[PDB]
UniProtKB/Swiss-Prot annotation:
This is Effector protein hopAB3. Its main location: secreted. Effector protein involved in gene-for-gene resistance in tomato plants. It is recognized by the host Pto resistance protein and elicits Pto and Prf-dependent hypersensitive response (HR) and programmed cell death (PCD), resulting in host immunity. In susceptible plants, promotes virulence, in part, by enhancing the development of disease symptoms and bacterial growth. The lineage of its organism: Bacteria, Pseudomonadati, Pseudomonadota, Gammaproteobacteria, Pseudomonadales. It is found in: Secreted. One of its GO terms (cellular component) is extracellular region. Interacts physically with plant cell Pto. GO terms for biological process: symbiont-mediated perturbation of host programmed cell death. Keywords: Hypersensitive response elicitation, Secreted, Virulence.
Length: 105
């Protein structure tokens, strides 16, 4: 007997201690990654949410109410308090970076 298909799976390592919030976290890449994946399961497509926020970071184009409220749900603010600060310090700039790099890498 044999198996023609096999796959030969990678033996995964151990996960960190704690519960829920320790795995996803909320700071920089942590808040960004947790946010976008939460948007995807809420139904907001990766391309749409990123297009909205990135256009607000670059062109200063307001985020549509659907994506905007979805961001407020995942803890991100779809506003520009001060455009100079909100291009660098903004949770949206972490969302644009994390979402682009999970596609770009």
């Amino acid at each position: 007997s044999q198996r023609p298909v096999d796959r030969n799976p990678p033996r995964i390592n151990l996960m960190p201690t704690g519960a829920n919030r320790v795995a996803m976290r909320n700071r920089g890449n942590n808040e960004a990654d947790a946010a976008l994946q939460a948007l995807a399961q809420n139904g907001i497509n990766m391309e749409d949410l990123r297009a909205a926020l990135e256009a607000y970071i670059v062109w200063l184009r307001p985020i549509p109410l659907d994506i905007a409220n979805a961001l407020e749900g995942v803890g991100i603010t779809p506003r520009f308090d001060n455009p100079e600060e909100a291009k660098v310090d903004n949770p949206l700039m972490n969302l644009s970076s994390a979402l682009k790099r999970r596609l770009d890498a």
